[PDB]
Ligand binder design. Structure first.
Ligand SMILES: CCCCCC/C=C\CCCCCCCCCC(=O)OC[C@H](COP(=O)(O)OCCN)OC(=O)CCC/C=C/CCCCCCCC
Ligand SMILES: [Fe+2]
Length: 661
């Protein structure tokens, strides 16, 4: 029953209007000069306490989010946290391109079901792009009336959101008929279509290339120096010398800091004990192997020495690097290296990428929005580093993590085991122990003289140190002493929410400036640099199934001797896994939205992030950071000229500011 006078506002307020209201209000609230709560006046203190109260209604913690139980998540994505037009157009462009490529590879009869819908999505996307360009053209022609254009930018966001919703329906329909739509490695090339194969497709079988994944691949975090081999990896002196030459020894290589180990023990349930039979993918296997790598005396390149396909040496024979002439050991070796790569996609995707970047930044985004006022300088600094993070994480949980989803198809373990393991790893990830300088130190991979070719370390420290100086300079503008740090009630509440609801292991009270600098560096590096280094290798290193796959269709090799090409081929996944792998990995590594150090809004009007003149001064803190980034960029390009293969993931021009893909 109605119509009541009190229902008068409700008649015309929609989500679109509310997005426009909020966007215009988000430029107005930026005019407020940033201040620490203790330095704000009474009026300022009251307003910020009222905003934070209303922020807690919108940004709500949950540990019961679908498909990610136990992981602190946002109950829902706020209106203002949906991706801006610029992110949506880029992402829709890649997805439409991929759908068009997939449908073109389908037999005409099977393609007939999707070709008309995909071409309509292509025309509509191009029309939406022409609207964005035309809006940008109007803004340049009349900058005074740019504020009045905001409404037409919101209408385009609604348009691209509706287009991506239609894209979502088409994907569902393609996947609903997935199994029915489905050298020996020809099926692995065929899934690409018009897309060119990555560099790995030609180099993967090479022993040096395989070892190089440990230092310049998507997972550069697990490799460690080994001083004495573990009791569960019984590689003997004679076996070592057979690979390393008659004049080398295990004891001297260990003392001369030349021995490096990959141990996948932490995979737990991501490495099932045996066969895992699934409806869509048949019988799947994944592993927790141990692998030994060594540097020669000259330390030229890292070489694979030995592989054990599991934790128990009693049930897992020792596979040793064979000679060009040892024909009878050739295939067993390719199978053992395939076991490491299977373990690698599981460890990289679920821990290094999913748990350690995405799911960590989820917690810091929520804590920032709930406890640091929009006028707080730490909020101003951190908010660009969380752009699109809540949205992309909700997508991982709802789109990638359900039963019969991409991860259920691509990763061997039962889907519940995958969710619980990825989740468990995130809860266990120590904030302080996970810092680049600390990770290098703990693993004894920090010394360039001991291990020269380690691109992630060298390029990573350049970015890490550039960020710490920026954070040190920024903190210094607002905190004149350690007293200002402890007297900050918002920062204190931010710490309390990170430890408590945030469940970030190792996080502790922030009692001073230096500590606040290290915390900020880790938060910013994790959201930007660390995410870029582990996400952007996905198209060039992970799209081709024979080079890496999170599931194998046959058990680990049972013997180093007597294996054949057919035995190794039996490990290759079914076509559906390869199909999903090429499409998801190209998508995830093709969207570069925002850039580290830019500090401008990534959506119209693209206004500066900082209004404080002390931050934005000529030669000031912000300019110095941007200039240091261009120096780091030039240093890396010089290093890549001398490297065996260019490592380009940590080039600052390729680092987005946030985790948004
Ligand atoms: C895999 C391990 C990664 C782990 C890391 C996870 C990190 C976070 C990444 C999260 C990524 C979230 C995934 C989405 C990223 C795109 C951004 C996005 O949010 O997409 C919006 C639309 C709308 O959504 P809606 O709810 O209406 O309907 C979803 C399905 N019921 O979703 C899609 O287009 C489906 C895209 C699925 C991928 C299709 C691939 C191309 C299709 C080509 C042809 C198909 C060939 C089979
Ligand atoms: Fe990512």
């Amino acid at each position: 029953a109605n119509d009541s006078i009190f229902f008068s506002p409700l008649k015309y307020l929609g989500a679109e209007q509310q997005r426009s209201i909020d966007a215009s209000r988000s430029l107005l609230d930026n005019l407020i000069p940033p201040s620490l709560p203790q330095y704000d006046n009474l009026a300022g203190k009251l307003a910020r306490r009222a905003v934070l109260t209303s922020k807690k209604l919108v940004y709500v913690w949950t540990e019961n989010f679908a498909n990610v139980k136990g992981v602190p998540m946002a109950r829902s994505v706020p209106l203002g946290e949906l991706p801006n037009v610029d992110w949506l157009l880029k992402t829709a462009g890649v997805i439409v391109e991929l759908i068009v490529n997939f449908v073109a590879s389908l037999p005409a009869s099977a393609a007939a079901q999707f070709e008309r819908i995909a071409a309509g999505l292509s025309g509509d996307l191009e029309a939406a792009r022409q609207v964005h360009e035309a809006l940008l053209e109007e803004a340049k022609n009349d900058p005074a009336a740019a504020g009045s254009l905001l409404l037409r930018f919101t209408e385009l966001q609604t348009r691209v959101i509706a287009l991506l919703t239609r894209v979502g329906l088409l994907v569902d329909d393609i996947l609903k008929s997935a199994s029915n739509l489905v050298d020996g490695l020809n099926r692995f090339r065929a899934v690409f279509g018009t897309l060119r194969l990555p560099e790995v497709a030609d180099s993967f079988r090479d022993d040096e290339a395989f070892a190089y994944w440990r230092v310049a691949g998507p997972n550069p975090l697990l490799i460690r120096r080994v001083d004495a081999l573990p009791a569960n990896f019984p590689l003997g002196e004679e076996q070592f010398r057979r690979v390393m030459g008659a004049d080398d020894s295990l004891l001297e290589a260990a003392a001369s800091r030349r021995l490096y180990l990959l141990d996948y023990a932490e995979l737990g349930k991501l490495a099932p004990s045996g066969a895992v039979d699934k409806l869509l993918t048949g019988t799947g296997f994944a592993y927790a192997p141990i692998a030994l790598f060594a540097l020669g005396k000259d330390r030229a390149g890292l070489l694979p020495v030995a592989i054990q396909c599991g934790q128990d040496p009693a049930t897992h024979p020792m596979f040793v690097r064979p000679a060009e002439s040892e024909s009878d050991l050739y295939w067993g070796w390719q199978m053992a290296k395939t076991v490491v790569q299977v373990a690698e996609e599981n460890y990289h995707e679920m821990f290094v990428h999913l748990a350690q970047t995405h799911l960590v930044s989820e917690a810091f985004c929520l804590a920032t929005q709930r406890t640091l006022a929009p006028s707080h300088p730490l909020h101003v600094l951190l908010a660009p580093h969380f752009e699109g993070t809540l949205f992309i994480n909700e997508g991982a949980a709802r789109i990638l993590l359900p039963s019969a989803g991409f991860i259920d198809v691509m990763f061997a373990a039962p889907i519940q085991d995958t969710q619980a393991t990825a989740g468990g790893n995130r809860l266990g990830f120590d904030f302080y122990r996970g810092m680049l300088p600390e990770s290098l130190k703990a693993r004894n991979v920090d010394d360039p003289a001991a291990l020269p070719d380690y691109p992630y370390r060298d390029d990573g420290l350049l970015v890490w140190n550039a960020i710490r100086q920026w954070a040190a300079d920024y903190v210094a503008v607002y905190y004149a002493s350690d007293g200002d740090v402890t007297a900050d009630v918002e920062l204190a509440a931010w710490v309390g929410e990170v430890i408590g609801s945030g469940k970030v292991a190792g996080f502790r009270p922030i009692t001073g400036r230096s500590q606040l600098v290290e915390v900020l560096t880790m938060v910013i590096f994790t959201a930007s640099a660390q995410h870029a280094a582990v996400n952007f290798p996905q198209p060039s290193m992970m799209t081709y199934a024979p080079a890496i796959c999170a599931m194998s269709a046959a058990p680990a090799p049972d013997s180093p001797s007597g294996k054949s090409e057919a035995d190794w081929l039996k490990m290759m996944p079914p076509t559906l896994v390869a199909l999903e792998k090429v499409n998801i990995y190209h998508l995830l590594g093709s969207v570069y939205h925002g850039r580290l150090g830019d500090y401008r809004q990534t959506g119209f009007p693209y206004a500066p992030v900082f209004s404080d003149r002390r931050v934005t001064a000529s030669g000031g803190p912000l300019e110095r950071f941007q200039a240091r980034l261009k120096e780091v960029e030039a240093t890396i390009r010089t290093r890549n000229q001398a490297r065996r293969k260019p490592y380009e993931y940590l080039l600052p021009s390729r680092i987005p500011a946030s985790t948004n893909i």
